[PDB]
Design a protein around this ligand. Structure first.
Ligand SMILES: CC(C)(COP(=O)(O)OP(=O)(O)OC[C@H]1O[C@@H](n2cnc3c(N)ncnc32)[C@H](O)[C@@H]1OP(=O)(O)O)[C@@H](O)C(=O)NCCC(=O)NCCS
Ligand SMILES: CC(C)(COP(=O)(O)OP(=O)(O)OC[C@H]1O[C@@H](n2cnc3c(N)ncnc32)[C@H](O)[C@@H]1OP(=O)(O)O)[C@@H](O)C(=O)NCCC(=O)NCCS
Ligand SMILES: CSCCC(=O)C(=O)O
Ligand SMILES: CSCCC(=O)C(=O)O
Ligand SMILES: [Mn+2]
Ligand SMILES: [Mn+2]
Ligand SMILES: [Mn+2]
Lengths: 408, 409
């Protein structure tokens, strides 16, 4: 019940998975998702209520307003200790491997009790050729010296990520990571920045890096996956199975292009399946805060999730097809694997049964009973026939529609 | 490789062909609120044929007289339209419980199609048998077997059997049920993760086990059918394939029960991008240029619209607002895009997909200004950029008109 002590490069046991939320950074990079300072601050406070281990709250060098907003979060959310449990979020900020960015990071985040910096540098041939116009040797010197610089400013909690790692040569990643560790990194991330990897391929990559990098046993490996081919969550899981013990996620999966790995999906996969098919890995997210966090982020960024969005979509605990309605009414475990209380979803007024074209007699019978009707089996068949006629005219049959079928 | 192979229900022309089984018009329509009119179904079926799906499952004919008639029309029209130059014609598929009324309705509705198929499904998990069917394992095996024989006696030669809730069923019981299904006449076997509980390594292990332990299963096609309740439907489908499945059951936009089915566009484009490099050569024959037209049609008719970050077909997939990503894209698109938007039916985006907002950078602003005919000094650019930073506090999206004001202040 009490929170483990925080050591940047070590975890209390072999199953703890740190949840690193970057809704306020990678998530805000989604087109149309820019947030005002009060919105970022309210979201950060709610991410602490969700009990994320780390929240990455912005990019200090980007602007005065970003710099000042981070300071405010570092001074407030970053110093608020949960009295009973001692939970304190890590406040993280991102920087390119440049002195200007890194100085902006220290000066904005140093007020937090647990400040962290992420320094990122591209390692892929494509980025080195077209983006940075640097050689592999130059990139290694820049990674190491930027990390030494962050350490000289006062950082002890330093994360390094090889941008576009998913398209980087696996042995060059180990070389960079090895120098990153020697220079002071306590967490290493290998992001699939462009969302190209398949889960077995990403897991294979993580496993290889952890087998072939000197010193890497004594730092935390972090998965950071993007969703361009629809597998960000599974890539994250595969990273965990390959030995990653931090995962970087956003609320609702917002982020660049097709987004990041959704927090609520990675966290609920571990919650449902971690003990059974994943060797006992777990997080300490308070999953009952998921829906409140999802709703706040949707309203502030303006990116609303589709009806079939996992965990927090409108349709996740709703059933319209007769055979599924019938099973749910017999026992909800027939077609639901999660209890909605666990993710903050208020319980269905109607048990999640909605009536439409494809509904069955058990559903219709069930609803009529709720509305106070004691109808015989023959009368049910007559009402159901008229209910079917009605679904050609209207898409959703309301309680009042149902009452008129009986009454009229 | 331009002509489609001859269609044999239980065989494929090579070890790498993956049949795409679209169930947008049946499992997808079961989404709360997604019910479709008959003309909407028919039009979507015609569009699925242009997408070149191998099989389209078009509905549940016992469900209603209207569903029955819609299916007949599709089977008579779309189900009989051959592209002579390539040999392409879709399989028209309908679903039935393991009940004689359902299967009789299936046959009477789809028999008109040139290639009719039926899916019979029966639960096999302990939870479903206990609480839903109230049946023993021996009852279920007998029901599976006699239902497939019955389907065969009506005229069905192309028969798929699915074990509902296979993701929570005992692996050896599935093998037992599948083995009786094969003997009865099934030519495809699906192991659905009906409730979306499996992780990818787990669904892959299950498929490998079934394929290694079921007598006769080498001579039928194995089909993955995965739901998205934990966000891994697409990945589970790919683990299915890596494990030996050579049919995938998908829906456009991933619509379906609860959190949906495996999105067709994601599975197909994953195979297009990666199949030859890390998946041993598996491939589909989908015309991916029809993805966006199909996505928009299904969205409009079901009413289920995709979020901005929906893969492949979302509004943000080929759009860049952050300065460093913009700078990368303007230097070379492959820095941050792995897919060409025209490959999936997308038009190539306004202003190279560079949109200006709070997090944009100077290269983006400079490039958008150049597009408008303004070449300015670096000093002038930095002055413009400071005013840009101020403007994004008042206006979320900076337009060409805004830029004109900014550079002429
Ligand atoms: C098919 C349909 C007409 C059945 O309507 P119904 O007779 O009123 O019965 P319900 O919808 O309430 O469905 C439950 C009945 O089917 C039984 N059943 C469910 N799945 C079954 C399966 N594979 N095999 C055999 N029986 C099954 C159920 O146990 C129940 O019957 P029972 O309680 O007498 O045992 C109606 O459900 C419908 O129109 N469905 C369209 C979409 C859908 O329901 N399911 C989509 C999955 S294919
Ligand atoms: C950071 C920021 C102020 C830079 O603004 P800028 O000076 O106008 O430069 P641009 O954004 O147009 O282009 C990026 C520049 O940084 C370089 N760069 C990109 N990644 C880098 C990295 N790890 N390390 C060092 N340099 C990097 C780029 O090459 C380019 O510089 P160059 O062409 O001179 O070599 C601006 O991009 C910004 O505000 N970004 C916020 C969101 C974002 O860009 N990225 C978020 C993901 S971390
Ligand atoms: C540690 S990753 C930082 C850059 C990033 O967000 C990405 O590469 O996707
Ligand atoms: C061929 S299996 C079809 C049954 C189904 O839709 C499911 O179990 O999800
Ligand atoms: Mn990222
Ligand atoms: Mn023709
Ligand atoms: Mn299904």
């Amino acid at each position: 019940e009490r929170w483990p002590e925080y050591i940047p490069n070590k975890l209390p046991d072999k199953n703890y998975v740190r949840v690193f939320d970057t809704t306020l950074r990678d998530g805000e990079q989604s087109p149309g998702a820019a947030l005002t300072p009060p919105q970022k601050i309210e979201i950060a406070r709610q991410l602490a209520k969700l009990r994320v281990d780390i929240m990455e709250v912005g990019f200090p060098v980007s602007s005065e307003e970003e710099f000042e907003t981070i300071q405010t979060i570092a001074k407030t959310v970053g110093n608020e200790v949960d009295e009973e449990t001692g939970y304190i979020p890590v406040i993280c900020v991102i920087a390119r491997s440049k002195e200007r960015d890194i100085k902006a990071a220290w000066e904005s985040v140093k007020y937090a009790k647990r400040p962290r910096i992420v320094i990122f540098t591209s390692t892929s041939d494509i980025h080195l050729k077209y983006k940075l116009k640097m050689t592999r040797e130059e990139v290694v010197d820049m990674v190491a010296s930027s990390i030494r610089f962050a350490k000289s400013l006062g950082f002890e909690d330093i994360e390094f990520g090889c941008e576009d790692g998913g398209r980087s040569d696996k042995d060059y990643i180990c070389t960079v990571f090895e120098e990153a560790i020697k220079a002071g990194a306590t967490t290493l991330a290998c992001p699939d920045t462009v969302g190209i990897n398949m889960p077995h391929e990403y897991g294979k990559l993580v496993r290889y890096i952890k087998a072939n990098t000197p010193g890497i046993d004594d730092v935390i490996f972090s998965a950071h996956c993007h969703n361009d081919l629809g597998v960000a969550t599974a890539n994250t899981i595969a990273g965990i199975c390959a030995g990653a013990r931090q995962v970087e996620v956003t609320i609702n999966g917002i982020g660049e292009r097709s987004g990041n790995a959704p927090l609520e999906e990675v966290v609920m996969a571990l919650k449902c399946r971690g003990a059974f098919v994943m060797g006992g890995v777990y997080t300490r997210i308070d999953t009952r805060q998921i829906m409140a966090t999802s709703k706040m982020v949707q309203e502030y960024t303006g990116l609303y999730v589709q009806p079939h969005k996992p965990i927090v979509g409108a349709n996740c605990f709703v059933h319209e097809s007769g055979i599924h309605q019938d099973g749910i009414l017999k026992n909800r475990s027939t077609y639901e694997i999660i209890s909605p209380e666990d993710v903050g979803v208020v319980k269905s007024q109607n048990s999640g049964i909605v009536l439409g074209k494809l509904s069955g007699r058990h559903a219709v019978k069930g609803r009529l009973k709720e509305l106070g009707y004691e109808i015989s089996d023959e009368k049910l068949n007559e009402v159901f026939s008229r209910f079917r006629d009605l679904t050609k005219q209207k898409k959703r049959v309301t309680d009042d529609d149902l009452k008129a079928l009986v009454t009229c």
